[PDB]
């Protein structure tokens, strides 16, 4: 059935200003700043306070409304990343052959290369997205931490890593090697 009004709401902790014009969100904060495009969705936005925002869809009918809460989370994730930030802690795993990871300035931007992935010689490189800072743990020297504001950049880069460090033509029930995420959190808490 076609509803009448389905509205969600977005809290806004202080220090943040959320500018919308023609479904283009822009968020700012202590950590930084961010933008997003939502032309592909029919949705409204109102300002009842500087402390929160009210998002709304009209008749919709069970397809627009599932994107309503989605949008709500996206904006909320954005605010969260420009207030706190995101931290993705990946970890190495192997049996015999270590994985030798480093960062390298190629002709363009940074990359992160890994060697000795199961003795392979193919130096497999990965680009770093622009919104990402990147480091190695020091309490234990067999992790890596991606970090930034935009989760859809951080997590996509981590997945880009662990998708290429995947063994092929072997029993995966045995060759549980590579790298994998282990913790998702922030860089304020």
């Amino acid at each position: 059935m076609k509803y009448i009004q389905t509205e969600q709401q977005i809290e806004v902790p202080e220090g943040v200003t959320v500018s919308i014009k023609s479904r283009i969100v822009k968020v700012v904060g202590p950590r930084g700043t961010l933008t997003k495009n939502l032309k592909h969705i029919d949705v409204t936005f109102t300002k009842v306070n500087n402390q929160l925002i009210k998002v709304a869809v009209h008749n919709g009918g069970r397809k627009h409304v599932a994107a309503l809460r989605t949008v709500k989370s996206l904006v909320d994730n954005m605010i969260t990343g420009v207030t706190k930030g995101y931290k993705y802690k990946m970890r190495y795993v192997y049996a015999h052959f270590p994985i030798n990871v480093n960062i390298v300035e190629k002709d363009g931007a940074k990359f992160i290369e890994v060697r000795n992935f199961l003795g392979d010689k193919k130096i497999r490189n990965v680009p770093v997205r622009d919104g990402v800072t990147i480091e190695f743990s020091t309490n234990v020297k067999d992790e890596i931490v991606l970090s930034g504001n935009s989760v859809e950049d951080v997590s996509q880069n981590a997945a880009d890593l662990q998708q290429i460090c995947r063994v092929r033509n072997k029993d995966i029930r045995k060759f549980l090697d590579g790298i994998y995420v282990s913790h998702k959190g922030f860089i304020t808490e």
Binding site: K2, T17, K21, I53
Partner: protein
């Protein structure tokens, strides 16, 4: 923080008490007022002051007018005529550019050829002054 520039749209929205203008029907052009709502696609109305009956109608046959006045849900003809006359809705309406243009069309259409010639004469005076002035 800095004031959050947030703005989406400020619709005129179907509600109880809203005024509408009928575009296609026996009572075309004549104003009316919504009373209550039957479904998404149709409502009922009562314009007594202009000679409109108490109809149930779709929202394709009408137009939503911005102006609005207060009344209770499900009201009757006498009550609506009461409130319409209190708010002086036809006065709020004839003020606007909308009705002004409507009446203007209705008057341009009703012109004799004599009037249509008088206009041609008169505009050959106004433009003379205006072209003298923009010099």
């Amino acid at each position: 923080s800095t004031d959050s520039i947030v703005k989406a749209s400020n619709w005129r929205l179907v509600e109880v008490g809203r005024v509408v203008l009928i575009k296609k029907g026996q009572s075309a052009g004549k104003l009316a007022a919504i009373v209550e709502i039957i479904d998404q696609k149709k409502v009922l109305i009562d314009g007594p002051k202009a000679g409109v009956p108490r109809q149930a109608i779709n929202l394709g046959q009408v137009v939503l007018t911005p102006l609005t006045f207060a009344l209770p849900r499900g009201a009757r003809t006498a009550t609506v005529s009461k409130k319409w006359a209190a708010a002086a809705v036809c006065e709020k309406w004839a003020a606007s550019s909308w009705a002004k243009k409507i009446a203007q069309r209705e008057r341009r259409a009703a012109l004799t050829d004599f009037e249509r010639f008088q206009v041609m004469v008169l505009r050959k005076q106004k433009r003379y002054t205006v072209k003298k002035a923009l010099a």
